[PDB]
Design a protein around this ligand. Structure first.
Ligand code: HEM
Length: 154
């Protein structure tokens, strides 16, 4: 699967809205993800004690995790599929002690898509929704192949 130049443009146009406030988008995304999938919070050794939305919003560690995640994802998206160099260390990091199943990356993808619908509907119409679905699917497909190269089936 590939994305066209037009699909990439839609993806990066809505991503520019995320970049206007990376930390806030990261908090919204992670809080949504952890409420929807408490098992995923267990994969973050330093965050797993957090329970209430106010406590999660107060956590500097959670905020930093959201910035790390979204900054790395933005760099990957701006590679427009030519992301082998970025995905290889990311696969390794996610295949250390806490293996991150592909399904958790899919749940993450659902969370960021929800945040985009909620925050930026004017820049997240039908065509942009389709393109973002495909961009995150491509990321997950290619990560899965890099997992396998390292001996992790995902
Ligand atoms: C459900 C989703 C995810 C979980 C549970 C998760 C979990 C983790 C964990 C446990 C590590 C630590 C490895 C270590 O301790 O050395 C890590 C590292 C990292 N992850 Fe994720 N991750 C997720 C999604 C993502 C995504 C989507 C991205 C970017 C596209 C990302 C970017 C990074 C980066 C850059 C690092 C290395 C920097 C650091 O250690 O803070 N993560 N992740």
């Amino acid at each position: 699967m590939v994305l066209s130049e037009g699909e990439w443009q839609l993806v990066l146009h809505v991503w520019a809205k995320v970049e206007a406030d990376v930390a806030g988008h990261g908090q919204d995304t992670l809080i949504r993800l952890f409420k929807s999938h408490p098992e995923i919070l267990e994969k973050f050794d330093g965050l797993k004690h957090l329970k209430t939305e106010a406590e999660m919003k107060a956590s500097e560690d959670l905020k930093e995790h959201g910035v790390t995640l979204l900054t790395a994802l933005g760099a990957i998206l701006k590679k427009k599929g030519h992301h082998e160099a970025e995905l290889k260390p990311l696969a390794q990091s996610h295949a250390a002690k806490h293996k991150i199943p592909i399904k958790h990356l899919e749940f993450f993808s659902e969370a960021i898509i929800h945040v985009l619908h909620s925050r930026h509907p004017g820049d997240f119409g039908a065509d942009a929704q389709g393109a973002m679905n495909k961009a995150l699917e491509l990321f997950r497909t290619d990560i899965a192949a890099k997992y396998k190269e390292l001996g992790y089936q995902g």
